[PDB]
Amino acid sequence: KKYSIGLDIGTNSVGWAVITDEYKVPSKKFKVLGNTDRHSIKKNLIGALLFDSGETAEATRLKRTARRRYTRRKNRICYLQEIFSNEMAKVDDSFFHRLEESFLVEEDKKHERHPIFGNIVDEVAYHEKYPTIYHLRKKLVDSTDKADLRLIYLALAHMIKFRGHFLIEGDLNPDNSDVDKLFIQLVQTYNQLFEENPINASGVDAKAILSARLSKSRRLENLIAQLPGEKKNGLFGNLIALSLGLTPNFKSNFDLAEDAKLQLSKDTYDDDLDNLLAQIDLFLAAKNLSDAILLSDILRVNTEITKAPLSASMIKRYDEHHQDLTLLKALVRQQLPEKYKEIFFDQSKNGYAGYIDGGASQEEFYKFIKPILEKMDGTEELLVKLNREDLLRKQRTFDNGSIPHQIHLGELHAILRRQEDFYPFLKDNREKIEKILTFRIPYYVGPLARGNSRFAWMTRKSEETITPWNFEEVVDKGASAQSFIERMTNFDKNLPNEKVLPKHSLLYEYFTVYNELTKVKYVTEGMRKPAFLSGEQKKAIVDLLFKTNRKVTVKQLKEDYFKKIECFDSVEISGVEDRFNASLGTYHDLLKIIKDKDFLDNEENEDILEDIVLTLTLFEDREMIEERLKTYAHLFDDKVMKQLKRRRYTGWGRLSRKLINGIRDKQSGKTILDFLKSDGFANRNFMQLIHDDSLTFKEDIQKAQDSLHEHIANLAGSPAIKKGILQTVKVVDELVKVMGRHKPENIVIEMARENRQITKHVAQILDSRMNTKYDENDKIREVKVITLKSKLVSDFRKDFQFYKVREINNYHHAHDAYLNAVVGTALIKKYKGRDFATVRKVLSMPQVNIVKKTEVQTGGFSKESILPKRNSDKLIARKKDWDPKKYGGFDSPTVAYSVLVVAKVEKGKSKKLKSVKELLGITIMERSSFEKNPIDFLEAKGYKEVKKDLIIKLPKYSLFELENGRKRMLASAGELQKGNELALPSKYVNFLYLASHYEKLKGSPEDNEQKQLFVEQHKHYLDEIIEQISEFSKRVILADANLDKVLSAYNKHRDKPIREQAENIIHLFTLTNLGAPAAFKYFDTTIDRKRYTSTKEVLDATLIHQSITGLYETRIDLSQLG
RNA sequence: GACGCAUAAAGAUGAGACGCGUUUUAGAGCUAGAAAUAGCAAGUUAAAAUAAGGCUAGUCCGUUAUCAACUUGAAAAAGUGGCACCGAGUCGGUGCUU
DNA sequence: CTAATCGCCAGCGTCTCATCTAATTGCGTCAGC
DNA sequence: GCTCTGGCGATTAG
């Protein structure tokens, strides 16, 4: 007996079929186990498996990072307390305790209920003097009197905890930048640097610069309007750098210095001055103007007598808010009394009371209040403010996302420099506080673990706790920046032990250029066939036409080389379009940088180069590059080092160094490069050298050279296709096992992926898994593995009237797999099947094995939102001591699996034990506690005298079978899902597909009237379809109300055309599809869903255990338990 | 079938940081009143938590992938279910055979 | 003191750095013959 | 040669 397997792979399904030799599906008699009353089930060999798609590991990553940002921040404050503790032991020895316990309710506090002062009068006075924290910060910055230590700590902690962003490097001075009339100093500097009496346009001032946007479309208009220049730099060649930075890196005018090379504000300025000193300013005022623009974009109050602009801006905002509020209140009271209580007392709307106490944002408040004041009188200023987002604003909003940290730090400095006079400790350890504020872990060091994390790579120099003060004396920076890169680069395919070489490297470029050049097929009149060049000619031509220029075309090789002879016009070439795809770029760059010849041509020096290009590829910071290059300082001049350290390379190659240079034969003593250079009159390239038996370069690879999951998990692609592939691999294995341990003859695969290599990998995996019997001479193909496109099956489907609709049932996966197998087997035989009646019989079969994979749930504990306190038993505590009846908490957890527990429980007024049997919900949070010791766990839950052996665990999608062939799957401890299929006969499906798509052609225009005539003489199929649906829904669905609503809805619309009627009959199958109930739409009526919330009807049913294929089964009669 | 150079649109993993949002508490409400109530005044901020927690005690870990039942085995992992013919409402009927 | 109904709710925006994959073009190779 | 779908708080009725 010989058979064949057909498969169809997807993201949420897989379909399998087995055909013997005539496109016929066999049938067999399998046996069942358990305490039931069955012994044999007759099953057909075709079906599908259904699961739910996997998901990427990105979201989890984000959560992890967020965690790491709350562990460090809480430390950032604790350090500060360590510096204040002793001093704070003298003023109030309970300040920190109250700050810690402020969250608890009034009764759980073991101290006073006022955090700061411990009094009522002092607290009220403090809140009255400083309405906000910004008043306190500005007062501490600007005043000169002795303050209280508590206020200093509060201000410092508020600045340390919220510390701005780190996107700008350098120094920023708000005092010298808030004055935006500096442009006159720019004009006078421009006049003094270039004496030609420049002209300018009067009318453009600081405010016009303020309104300018980052988009160059408005920037060009601003620059042409502000000054009509006299030269290229005047128009836009220089002012762009002054306004924002020299973003272009190409010469706009020769007069800048020589060319244009400056960039924006980063760590490059300290070297970019080398561009200007050679051509000695506007470059100093450019920074001031750019800083002025970028700082006045966010700050309104310019500095006159204050060193704190941010606090002044916030105070001004607060005062304007108060004034606008009182004016609006008075006017609204005077002109529209009826709306008053609607806007200032109701929290359920978007009024002012819903803006402060409710949950509305600025946009909703403005959109709700604009029409209210639109029809009023005396609302011009408020209306114009509402269009600029300045009406009744708050201090802490989203717009604060663009505050640099260099602002915050500035204020901190001031707050110390005064109060250090009265407190010696502040002067003693000011630098500690600054370092606490402005310390960040570099992105190339990562976590600071001690070998217990699978994410870290850091290497230490000693053994001691790591703090911001002794960071650079415990951790190692070069050894960490090296491992940050060495843990991601590829290995050499030929030898899986060596690291690859950087893409730009002298050895690698030599290999590439010689490999390309050695196969030149030059032809001449005298020599009719393409010969191969000799070693000395290559050695001459490489330096003649490669070490002097980087780019060479065909003309250069045809003319320049043959100048010594007369055959320059008689040599023709082939295999090159117009140039060579190789160059000695690194050689030319090092020649320009070093300006020396012998150091590059000498072989003995190449080792040094092998490091000079290595570091320039690994590191990215200037400091570490300089530290590594310090070793070779004496080799070149200081100017040479300064110009060299500005060169950066990226990328990596694919061939290591041990293979290109370092391995040689024992009978020749030459390396691959040597042979490729001087093979002789007949030359061979890398591919011919490596795959050669005359020299011992083959066996070296063989002597230089595993579970399934760890090999699957290394493919490239989305995890969904990986899940599908892993399922298919096991489906094939079980199918092989079932039918007598005889391997198939063909396997036909078809992929279907959406957002020609994954198919080649799956085919490789299956072929390597199947072909094991290895011959001894050379290689045997016991089985084949065919690959098929998706067009052929679709054409065979749409040509012979084998239509399909996906809304009826889940039977189309198996039919697709069967058709794939049939078409492939037929097609690989001739180098359109026969007896189509067999195909129709197979596709009209009522028995197909559809199984849904059972799974235990994983994920988050419960819903992420925190709910207000209320008296209920569904609230989950947030910490252990926070009782949800006083602080709120989470609700609606997620269950992992359920358990069938049978035992006694006290009940009734008599307080007596009664036998009971119920399900239970073991949440994700409680899984470990149950699995560690179940008996105690569910004895503390209420039950007692529990039988140990009768406990059964039921994952999601467990299958129960009830009376009259009614199947329900399980979804939770208190909900069920439908589990049956509808097997509609083929003729109804064929008619129903043709009725739809009525207005659009399906084939030739001359062969379409027959389909119409068919639909008019078979119009009366709709009643039969409705009767079929009604009978099925009466037998297995039990949805009488929805069914008799659907019946009336259909009966009311019998006069509509056929197209709409059929297109809406298609919509009615949502009532009978398995899975979760869903709401569908008829013509105009809407039908709501019916959900099964009672799970007590499956405790007397039969529990079915199923295999992945679905043919092996186990049945348990639950009526005998108890 | 696989390997080394010449290409412009998407993804897939890991690291370092900002700005909001939500819960509880603090910021003394007044007057007419027997009562349920009514009239007025105020509103912009701060503290703590941000998966319950763990031991290996780190300025570290805790939402990805894997998962029918029974027998052996801590785990790794290994094993367990007859064949032909006629038919078709979720699979039946007949004949050999352990 | 439980079973059939109808209805409402679910955390979200942004910035820097590094390493891998891959479909088609033309280049010359092996695998084989 | 060449190859979306479970939880939760209300309603009236057996």
UniProtKB/Swiss-Prot annotation:
Belongs to the CRISPR-associated protein Cas9 family. Subtype II-A subfamily. CRISPR (clustered regularly interspaced short palindromic repeat) is an adaptive immune system that provides protection against mobile genetic elements (viruses, transposable elements and conjugative plasmids). CRISPR clusters contain spacers, sequences complementary to antecedent mobile elements, and target invading nucleic acids. CRISPR clusters are transcribed and processed into CRISPR RNA (crRNA). In type II CRISPR systems correct processing of pre-crRNA requires a trans-encoded small RNA (tracrRNA), endogenous ribonuclease 3 (rnc) and this protein. It is an enzyme of class 3 (hydrolase). One of its GO terms (biological process) is defense response to virus. Its EC number is 3.1.-.-. Only has nuclease activity when bound to both gRNAs (crRNA plus tracrRNA), which results in conformational changes in the protein and formation of a central channel which binds target DNA. Also requires interaction with PAM to trigger catalytic activity. Nuclease activity is inhibited by EDTA. It comes from the Bacteria. Gene3D superfamilies: 1.10.30.50, Ribonuclease H-like superfamily/Ribonuclease H. This is CRISPR-associated endonuclease Cas9/Csn1. Changing residue 72 to A: Significantly decreased DNA cleavage. Disruption phenotype: Loss of correct processing of pre-crRNA and tracrRNA. Loss of immunity against a plasmid with homology to CRISPR spacer sequences.
